[PDB]
Amino acid sequence: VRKQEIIKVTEQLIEAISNGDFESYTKMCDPGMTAFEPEALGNLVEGLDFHRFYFENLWSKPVHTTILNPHIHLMGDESACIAYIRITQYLDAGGIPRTAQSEETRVWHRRDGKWQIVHFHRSGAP
Amino acid sequence: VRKQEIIKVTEQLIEAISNGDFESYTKMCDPGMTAFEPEALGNLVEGLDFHRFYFENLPVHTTILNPHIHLMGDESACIAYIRITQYLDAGGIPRTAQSEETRVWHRRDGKWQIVHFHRSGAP
Amino acid sequence: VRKQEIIKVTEQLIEAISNGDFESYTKMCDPGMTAFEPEALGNLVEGLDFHRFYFENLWSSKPVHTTILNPHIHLMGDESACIAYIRITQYLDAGGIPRTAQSEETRVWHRRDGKWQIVHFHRSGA
Amino acid sequence: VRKQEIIKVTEQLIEAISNGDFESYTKMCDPGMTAFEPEALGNLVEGLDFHRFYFENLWSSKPVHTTILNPHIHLMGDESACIAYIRITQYLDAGGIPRTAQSEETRVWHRRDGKWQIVHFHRSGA
Amino acid sequence: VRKQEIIKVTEQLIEAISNGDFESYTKMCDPGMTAFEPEALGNLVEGLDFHRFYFENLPVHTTILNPHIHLMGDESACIAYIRITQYLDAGGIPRTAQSEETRVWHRRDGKWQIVHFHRSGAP
Amino acid sequence: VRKQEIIKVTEQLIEAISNGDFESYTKMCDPGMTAFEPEALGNLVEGLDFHRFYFENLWSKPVHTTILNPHIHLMGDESACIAYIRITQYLDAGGIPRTAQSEETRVWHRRDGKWQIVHFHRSGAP
Amino acid sequence: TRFTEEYQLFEELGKGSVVRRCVKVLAGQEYAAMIINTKKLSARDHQKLEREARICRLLKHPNIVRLHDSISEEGHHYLIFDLVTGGELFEDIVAREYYSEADASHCIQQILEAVLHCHQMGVVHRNLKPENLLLASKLKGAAVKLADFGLAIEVEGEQQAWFGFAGTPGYLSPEVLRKDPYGKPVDLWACGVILYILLVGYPPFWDEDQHRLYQQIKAGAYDFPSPEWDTVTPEAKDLINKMLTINPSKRITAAEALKHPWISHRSTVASCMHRQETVDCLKKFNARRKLKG
Amino acid sequence: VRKQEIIKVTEQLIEAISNGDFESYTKMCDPGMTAFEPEALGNLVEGLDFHRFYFENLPVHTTILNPHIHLMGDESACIAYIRITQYLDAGGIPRTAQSEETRVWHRRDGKWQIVHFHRSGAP
Amino acid sequence: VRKQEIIKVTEQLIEAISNGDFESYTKMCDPGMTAFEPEALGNLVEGLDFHRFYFENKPVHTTILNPHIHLMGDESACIAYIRITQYLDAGGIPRTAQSEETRVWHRRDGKWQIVHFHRSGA
Amino acid sequence: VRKQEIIKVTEQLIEAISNGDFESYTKMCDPGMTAFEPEALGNLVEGLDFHRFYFENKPVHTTILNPHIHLMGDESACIAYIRITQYLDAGGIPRTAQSEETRVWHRRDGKWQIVHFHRSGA
Amino acid sequence: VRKQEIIKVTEQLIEAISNGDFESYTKMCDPGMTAFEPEALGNLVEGLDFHRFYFENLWSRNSKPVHTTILNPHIHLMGDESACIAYIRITQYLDAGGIPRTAQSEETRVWHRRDGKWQIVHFHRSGA
Amino acid sequence: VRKQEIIKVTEQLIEAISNGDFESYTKMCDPGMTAFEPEALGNLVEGLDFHRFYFENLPVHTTILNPHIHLMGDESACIAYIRITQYLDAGGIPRTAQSEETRVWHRRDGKWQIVHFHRSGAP
Amino acid sequence: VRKQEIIKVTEQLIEAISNGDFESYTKMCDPGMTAFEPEALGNLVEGLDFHRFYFENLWSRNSKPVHTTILNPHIHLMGDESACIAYIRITQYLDAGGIPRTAQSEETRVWHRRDGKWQIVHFHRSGA
């Protein structure tokens, strides 16, 4: 039962990223969140100011997201970690169907009864 | 004060890998430890069976840049850092490699252990 | 006779994929269908949600001709069978320029309640 | 229980391939075994003559470790089954330099006269 | 004298392909005709169903270089030649392509028909 | 029964090429034989003088040859044609197992009760 | 080089390298030869070679296969210890038509005999398990012989250390799962998980989640579920509690386990009722672990 | 004491670049300023004459990572940092570019001026 | 006049690098010296622990082109130059590499020292 | 003196090619003229049916470099030269291409004609 | 400077090239001038018709901004009537799209004074 | 009449190249012979001075395909053919190379001499 | 006559380079000589120490045969004490293996007579 909550908040996070809802994204992220991601060019970026740019500019083409083989590590009643494979089927400029893989790690911390990302790590193609 | 504990067990970890000490490495890792790394080719590997191949089969200087630590209680932490590696190829020339590393530590029975780790870059 | 029966349901499968008819494609596939295909990027995909993106977008339509080469059928009892063949597709890209593509396909059929359904399939080089 | 039985004969298969024991590999394979693999260059290979070249030459031997990821088993009656999984091989090339390779494998097992035999198998990216 | 018959039916064949006339092409080919060609991607295609896609879906000047003819009786022949093709791409520039072609003709009921053909090079 | 003879002489030809037996090769070839082959660089070469070079210099490493999907066209009692796919498993300079595909056409003509190649056409990798 | 001339080779025994029966030509006698291909793992392997070969040169017990020589050839290495054809023990036992507390005490006794010897020799086996337990011959009264491998080690006197993480998840002591220094004791804990299977024919700990199996093994969570344990002498259950002790310093030594005879004296005093059900479960477990392991 | 004082004129420099104000950039740079940059193609270019072309011919987001300030007395400073720029390419696709920047500041008549500039290795 | 002193300590620096003399290099560098260089892979490395590895590891020729010196007071300077290096690659073919180097000198305790240096190219 | 006649018929040839005048080109070529050129893909093409296609298909500039003329009697000659061509590619960027051309002239019926020509490059 | 004279006529040459002024460029060049440049594909072109193509088509059309920088000029004086300048030419320009690009070209100009006026008898360019 | 007469001196040329006999090659070539060839890198090289380097520093098999001879009176001829060379590379692997060759022969004092040579495009 | 003089000293220069004779090359070169060549990586090197590396290491070791060809020399005379030659330099050599290779380099040599002797004040090379 305890892992289903992490599944819920994680799916809500991916839904916020897919729909480009940056406000819901900011609610589910700690203000001092750190991130390793291919868009950071091997650098560690802190805060949400770096992801806002992708929410505004990049995000009505049909896109489908698939979550493969999630693994959840529970570390108490206030901290959890989830790692999963993310597949994205989309359309390019030519309208051709395409697919992209991405390995993702999310570090959740329960603050004021609300889970928030303190750090995340994405790899593979962006 | 607690951050230096995570840093301490992390340095002990990196040295346990550099010397090829699979015993101390096994003690510092959870049996259900999960891993993302270029050696896994985009897959998620579980346990320490995947990492044994390297201690058994495999002049190096390691450098850690900008370590960040997230404490999540008194039994859970997460450290992220840049890992530069200066080594020599069989050609003899000094080469340098970068890898971004994320370690997730959990205190169990009064001892920190890795439950999951995520590395990117240098294979 | 049974071999020919497998050929029948297989031809109906190829025609359903070509017409972009996801309705008929759903009936011939098990709800928990297993899949290996290049669109999954080396991952194992379960269900029909993954192929729905290709039924909705791409296949809903320029002239395309399919050709099946060297089909082999293994009968494994009354309720199980497996067919392997080479699929060659002739099509047109943008302003054709006629193109051709090869793939090696394996289908694993299983009769459930008097109806052949795909339980798993494997595709290469597409 | 039956799923585990398939796992047993499959592990014995992988061990037989790793040890270069073509004798045991022959028993677990049907004489008319069908095969799709990158060593066949998109062609369908029948029999065990084709893999004999790899049993005789290459596998007859540096340290090699295999790892099976995400195995799925479809049971299709008492006498038929199919398993699909991801094989990851850690090895050494020339003067290692440790290397790793991924392949996606499908085995189609069929019990003939009280013994599981491979009737067809499919491999990708190796 | 007989070689010019094979050359004649061959030129009629190439013109039947250039004009997109699948009817005359079908008359000049055996129903069990086999084919090797780059469009088949290393496979051997049987019948004329594979070639219909081109007559239906698909400024060209064709040139034949060094035709060799092998007569094997009064009902079997085999011609091999180089086929140069001068055409225009959508970019408008004149392009040239080479393809080595082998045709196997068989007289059936007093009419030569292709039983098998093998092309290499230009796809 | 008539096609089995062509299979016999063809397998004898491939055996002569594999064993580097140039004299048996000359017996099964017409003196005025023509050939299209990748080693001829798109040119048509006549006679056996061009293949002798490959018999002498290139040809004790283990090599296995596989003949896939032969098709035979009988054109009387003195002329026949066979087309097939040829797979070659070999070892390179590094000892690594390798495989090569080649599409081949052989035009046989019975002279003095003995089949001989009047023309052949090979494509794919040499 | 030298094994080429003196010895003749015959059928395979097992595989992993390959075991094969041979016979010395010069003084005619059979042995069993480990053929360790020159491809092992570079160093980590070669280290375990000389360790295994050294340990076995040192271990000469009537209940343990003794080595003879270790010969190095060009593309191979050979290790010739003592030969056997006995089948496995957990395999022979099921074939028995009378299995009792008194046959099980006859086993754990010989076992503890091989163990004690080496514990006196400053060496710990660390991998103790049914697989590693074999029968000299199928001939009557054949002896149980400990199989020396290979996650093995040489301790100093009684000094406890961290020798690294090795052995089989079910056969692992808690001191090793806790990542604490260990020693000879980690061998006694195995016997205890072994005896328990040597009675009821199922293991004391197990879970499919191996994280959980380990928790049990760290928590000492085992119990004697009725009815099957009801017919078991309380002495049996006593030893089992002495070996299965979580604290290694409190754990019964091997020397102590021989003197307390729920084995030697219950051989004299214990329950012989042939337990057919236990034997059956046992056989089943065996097949499973062979396929699952 | 003056680290914030350096950050002030650095921020004013960034604002002068962002607004395309070449006059303010001229006020903050020494007349004989030298610059290494990828646009210089490995050459040492002197003066503001080279940067002029960019102030007269030019949606992005800039991030400064790991700033280090070296105070060299009461009239010299040197700041080094990593600059990550997120932008939209001609394809309208999000792209990101990394640069490593070093600014050398000199105090003359109570004002900080750039006496040398060094960037690598993205334009 | 005070330009050939920057040139002097710079020549002692380059010569200390070519001779593999870590002992002198440490004296010429501040303990908290920062560096940008290709060997750092875009990261900023502080101290000399990173540069130590490149002293443990035949004829080469170095040519310095267009040296420009900026004097900032009487206790700080900065020299930028192009460094060309001719060498031989295992097979022995002559090769040449270009680098763009910037050294930042500061006089503390009566001695010029590198506080930060920036390199581009090889 | 008789070199500028080879140059004259060569200039009328090149000008006939640039104007797309197949009519004059046919007059300047023997009916059985052989040709090696990149457009022939390594094959030897005989006649003018192959060159016709390249007459059906904006400002270009041609420069002839290092013309060498071999005179062989009074009814046969051979001129070899390098032909540089500046043009524009769809996007309009100026481009330049190099060619190595060899023309073989022969006087039959009182008229110089190409019997065979060989081209390398573009 | 005489050095200043050669730099003056050199900057007038580059100014005539940047503006596509073929008249001034013709006046500053000897009729028998030879040239090595990447546009010649490793050949030695002689005259001015080869550069006329670029003056007419490429450089006459330029309405976009172009800024030229002459880095590290070196002058060799060889008597009263001859000089030779070598420099690195860096061109900042706008490409087909509105993206600023930079090009480097090593340039050698050989000046000879005839009729009281300096003229190029030969130049040599490298890089693109 | 003279086509065989041209083939004779052509064969003698091939023999002079095969034997490495530079003197016989000198006798068969005009002192002012010009040559286009891939080894000339697109340049027109005159004389035998360029080919000398190959006669003083050099298992193969040569094949001549599609020879065409142009007789231009009683003192001029021109032969063109395709030359296919089979050889063994440094790897000991069979390799093949195609060239297109044009020889221009002139008769002076009753002997044929090469006045121009043109090869493309393999060395 | 003067054209022949410049070709003579040019062929003596190339002869000194082919033999690795740094003494003769030094005598034929001005101390303040500048250079553009691919070995300088787009930079203008001055002096002779940059070429000394190639004389000592590369060209001194050569025992293999090397043949140099000077194609299409053009000479510009600029008074009694100055000249400029441009030519295509084609080098036939043997590589690491025994395979003949050819290299092309466009060369400009600027000659100035001082102390009654011609010397290079500047040269410019292209291609490799």
UniProtKB/Swiss-Prot annotation, chains I, J:
Palmitoylated. Probably palmitoylated by ZDHHC3 and ZDHHC7. It is found in: Synapse; Postsynaptic density; Cell projection, Dendritic spine; Cell projection, Dendrite. Signal peptide: none annotated. Coiled coil: none annotated. There are 4 genes encoding calcium/calmodulin-dependent protein kinase type II chains: CAMK2A, CAMK2B, CAMK2G and CAMK2D. The corresponding proteins assemble into homo- or heteromultimeric holoenzymes composed of 12 subunits with two hexameric rings stacked one on top of the other. Interacts with BAALC. Interacts with MPDZ. Interacts with SYN1. Interacts with CAMK2N2. Interacts with SYNGAP1. Interacts with SYNPO2. Interacts with SHANK3. Interacts with GRIN2B. Interacts with CACNB2. Interacts with LRRC7. Interacts with GRM5. Belongs to the protein kinase superfamily. CAMK Ser/Thr protein kinase family. CaMK subfamily. Calcium/calmodulin-dependent protein kinase that functions autonomously after Ca(2+)/calmodulin-binding and autophosphorylation, and is involved in various processes, such as synaptic plasticity, neurotransmitter release and long-term potentiation. Member of the NMDAR signaling complex in excitatory synapses, it regulates NMDAR-dependent potentiation of the AMPAR and therefore excitatory synaptic transmission. Regulates dendritic spine development. Also regulates the migration of developing neurons. Phosphorylates the transcription factor FOXO3 to activate its transcriptional activity. It is linked to Intellectual developmental disorder, autosomal dominant 53: A disorder characterized by significantly below average general intellectual functioning associated with impairments in adaptive behavior and manifested during the developmental period. This is Calcium/calmodulin-dependent protein kinase type II subunit alpha. The chain holds residues 345 to 472 of 478 of the full protein.
